[PDB]
Design an enzyme around this catalytic site. Structure first.
Site, mmCIF file in Angstrom:
data_model
loop_
_atom_site.group_PDB
_atom_site.id
_atom_site.type_symbol
_atom_site.label_atom_id
_atom_site.label_comp_id
_atom_site.label_asym_id
_atom_site.label_seq_id
_atom_site.Cartn_x
_atom_site.Cartn_y
_atom_site.Cartn_z
ATOM 1 N N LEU B 13 -38.190 -4.709 11.478
ATOM 2 C CA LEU B 13 -39.483 -4.552 12.169
ATOM 3 C C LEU B 13 -40.664 -4.246 11.233
ATOM 4 C CD1 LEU B 13 -38.654 -2.656 15.495
ATOM 5 C CD2 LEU B 13 -38.738 -5.103 15.123
ATOM 6 N N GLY B 14 -40.341 -3.702 10.066
ATOM 7 C CA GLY B 14 -41.315 -3.472 9.020
ATOM 8 C C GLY B 14 -40.628 -2.997 7.755
ATOM 9 N N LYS B 15 -41.314 -3.148 6.629
ATOM 10 C CA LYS B 15 -40.828 -2.718 5.325
ATOM 11 C C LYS B 15 -42.077 -2.272 4.598
ATOM 12 C CE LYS B 15 -38.865 -6.028 2.729
ATOM 13 N NZ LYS B 15 -40.172 -6.823 2.843
ATOM 14 N N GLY B 16 -42.008 -1.147 3.908
ATOM 15 C CA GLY B 16 -43.166 -0.644 3.177
ATOM 16 C C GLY B 16 -42.665 0.162 2.011
ATOM 17 N N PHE B 18 -42.134 3.334 1.535
ATOM 18 C CA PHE B 18 -41.185 4.431 1.776
ATOM 19 C C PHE B 18 -39.862 4.067 2.442
ATOM 20 C CE2 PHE B 18 -44.740 6.791 0.390
ATOM 21 C CZ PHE B 18 -45.844 6.326 1.123
ATOM 22 N N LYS B 20 -37.873 1.173 5.610
ATOM 23 C CA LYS B 20 -37.911 0.099 6.598
ATOM 24 C C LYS B 20 -37.731 0.634 8.014
ATOM 25 C CE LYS B 20 -33.459 -1.309 4.495
ATOM 26 N NZ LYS B 20 -33.002 -2.415 3.578
ATOM 27 N N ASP B 131 -54.682 10.955 12.056
ATOM 28 C CA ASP B 131 -54.490 9.589 11.554
ATOM 29 C C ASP B 131 -54.607 8.531 12.646
ATOM 30 O OD1 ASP B 131 -54.032 7.795 9.332
ATOM 31 O OD2 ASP B 131 -51.861 7.975 9.559
ATOM 32 N N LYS B 133 -55.475 5.366 14.281
ATOM 33 C CA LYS B 133 -55.912 4.046 13.834
ATOM 34 C C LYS B 133 -55.183 3.009 14.652
ATOM 35 C CE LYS B 133 -52.759 3.995 9.854
ATOM 36 N NZ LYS B 133 -52.709 3.795 8.365
ATOM 37 N N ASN B 136 -51.457 2.690 14.301
ATOM 38 C CA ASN B 136 -50.657 3.810 14.785
ATOM 39 C C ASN B 136 -50.543 3.901 16.279
ATOM 40 O OD1 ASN B 136 -50.098 4.484 12.219
ATOM 41 N ND2 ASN B 136 -51.112 6.503 12.215
HETATM 42 C C1 LIG Z 1 -41.325 3.458 13.831
HETATM 43 C C2 LIG Z 1 -42.232 3.273 15.050
HETATM 44 S S1 LIG Z 1 -41.753 4.598 16.207
HETATM 45 C C3 LIG Z 1 -41.443 3.552 17.659
HETATM 46 C C4 LIG Z 1 -41.490 2.144 17.125
HETATM 47 N N1 LIG Z 1 -41.148 1.080 17.862
HETATM 48 C C5 LIG Z 1 -41.225 -0.118 17.266
HETATM 49 N N2 LIG Z 1 -41.612 -0.370 16.006
HETATM 50 C C6 LIG Z 1 -41.945 0.682 15.241
HETATM 51 N N3 LIG Z 1 -42.378 0.397 13.950
HETATM 52 C C7 LIG Z 1 -43.674 0.976 13.527
HETATM 53 C C8 LIG Z 1 -43.922 0.947 12.018
HETATM 54 N N4 LIG Z 1 -43.822 -0.461 11.594
HETATM 55 C C9 LIG Z 1 -44.548 -0.909 10.542
HETATM 56 O O1 LIG Z 1 -44.448 -2.070 10.120
HETATM 57 C C10 LIG Z 1 -45.877 -0.256 10.275
HETATM 58 N N5 LIG Z 1 -46.911 -1.304 10.495
HETATM 59 C C11 LIG Z 1 -45.962 0.418 8.894
HETATM 60 C C12 LIG Z 1 -45.064 1.607 8.570
HETATM 61 C C13 LIG Z 1 -45.353 2.947 8.664
HETATM 62 N N6 LIG Z 1 -44.291 3.795 8.256
HETATM 63 C C14 LIG Z 1 -43.291 2.946 7.878
HETATM 64 C C15 LIG Z 1 -41.998 3.241 7.387
HETATM 65 C C16 LIG Z 1 -41.148 2.155 7.063
HETATM 66 C C17 LIG Z 1 -41.575 0.810 7.230
HETATM 67 C C18 LIG Z 1 -42.866 0.531 7.726
HETATM 68 C C19 LIG Z 1 -43.709 1.621 8.044
HETATM 69 C C20 LIG Z 1 -42.553 -1.115 11.963
HETATM 70 C C21 LIG Z 1 -42.233 -0.980 13.458
HETATM 71 C C22 LIG Z 1 -41.900 1.993 15.793
#
Ligand SMILES: C[C@@H]1SCc2ncnc(N3CCN(C(=O)[C@H](N)Cc4c[nH]c5ccccc45)CC3)c21
Lengths: 10, 318
Positions: B13-16, B18, B20, B131, B133, B136
């Site tokens: 769902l995301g990678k950054g 710190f 994933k 924070d 935004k 968020n």
């Molecule tokens: C974790 C949150 S809590 C409930 C929730 N539900 C779906 N996706 C989520 N994420 C949000 C954060 N996402 C990101 O891509 C953000 N746009 C950037 C990010 C912030 N902290 C991170 C830690 C690890 C990876 C990405 C992030 C992925 C999906 C989240």
């Protein structure tokens, strides 16, 4: 839109 | 209480920097959750230890319709895991990107829910979020707002108590935070101003690519609005975006209560907001449950893979 933004701290 | 193995790992769902975030199925229950998986190495190495603890503590003692709940929180030799309610609807940032602007009604709805959440944090938990935004603010299956990512919160902030820490996201910083003044809980309202500004106007209210030029705008330029924006919307945004925090709507002892009473929110029954009795203006359209439409293909189309933290581990009471 705009570019994605970054959360920081100092 | 749980470990890495009690979950199947379905989609990224995301990678950054710190870590994933993986969409997960919990084996014992069939419930889908969102796992933030941080690499302990990175957290300690990038100095993100204190923030990570703050997020654990803030999520542990908050229960609210519009704040991301936390089910379990655990560790490994190399990992910190936060196991949380899945926001199927993705980031607000995702939807604005594609629609440009939201109607006032739709912005009113998201703003009432944010106001409800920030009020609970201020008045009940003594927390200042700091924070706010688009990134968020997420949507759940029904299209209710979910505030995520609490590591920059300040705790034990009662009434006019004030903080010193330079933190947030540059485009969103309040003038008083930029002045390097002490600042109070009104910073959250400046933020609500900004996200609500972006929702109704389709751009940030202050922007340059250069942080220092951006900061001048935030400190010096008085706001301007698209000429189609209605007067109540315009008055709300003006009040939330006062540079002087003591003049900001929400800046007094009344706090949130001052914004709840604004003509922009005339129709709203705050108790129905909290009770989710209002017609969300957008239900995420997912075929199933591992539908990840509203998350970036850069991520969703991938294949998936040092000290101890005192009292990190936590499970959600029944
Ligand atoms: C974790 C949150 S809590 C409930 C929730 N539900 C779906 N996706 C989520 N994420 C949000 C954060 N996402 C990101 O891509 C953000 N746009 C950037 C990010 C912030 N902290 C991170 C830690 C690890 C990876 C990405 C992030 C992925 C999906 C989240």
């Amino acid at each position: 839109g705009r570019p994605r933004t970054t959360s920081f701290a100092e | 209480r749980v470990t890495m193995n009690e979950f199947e790992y379905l989609k990224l769902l995301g990678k950054g920097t710190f870590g994933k975030v993986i969409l997960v199925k919990e084996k014992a229950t069939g419930r889908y959750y969102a796992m933030k998986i941080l690499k302990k190495e990175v957290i300690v190495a990038k100095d993100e230890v204190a923030h990570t603890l703050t997020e654990n503590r803030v999520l542990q003692n908050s229960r609210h319709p519009f704040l991301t709940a936390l089910k379990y929180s655990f560790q490994t030799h190399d990992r910190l895991c936060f196991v949380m309610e899945y926001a199927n609807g993705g980031e607000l940032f995702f939807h604005l990107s594609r629609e440009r602007v939201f109607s006032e009604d739709r912005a009113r709805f998201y703003g009432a829910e944010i106001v409800s959440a920030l009020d609970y944090l201020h008045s009940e938990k003594n927390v200042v979020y700091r924070d706010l935004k688009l990134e968020n603010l997420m949507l759940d299956k029904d299209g209710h707002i979910k505030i995520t990512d609490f590591g920059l919160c300040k705790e034990g902030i009662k009434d006019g108590a004030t903080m010193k820490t330079f933190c947030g996201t540059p485009e969103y910083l309040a003038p008083e935070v930029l002045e390097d003044n002490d600042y109070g809980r009104a910073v959250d309202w400046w933020g609500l101003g900004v996200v609500m500004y972006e929702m109704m106007c389709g751009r940030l209210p202050f922007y340059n690519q250069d942080h220092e030029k951006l900061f001048e705008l935030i400190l010096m330029e008085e706001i301007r609005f698209p000429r189609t924006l209605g007067p109540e919307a315009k008055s709300l945004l003006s009040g939330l975006l006062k540079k002087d925090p003591k003049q900001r709507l929400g800046g007094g002892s009344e706090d949130a209560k001052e914004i709840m009473q604004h003509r922009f929110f005339a129709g709203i029954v705050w108790q129905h907001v909290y009770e989710k009795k209002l017609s969300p203006p957008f239900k995420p359209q997912v075929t199933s449950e591992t539908d990840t439409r509203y998350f970036d293909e850069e991520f969703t189309a991938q294949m998936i893979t040092r000290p101890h933290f005192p009292q990190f581990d936590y499970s959600a009471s029944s």
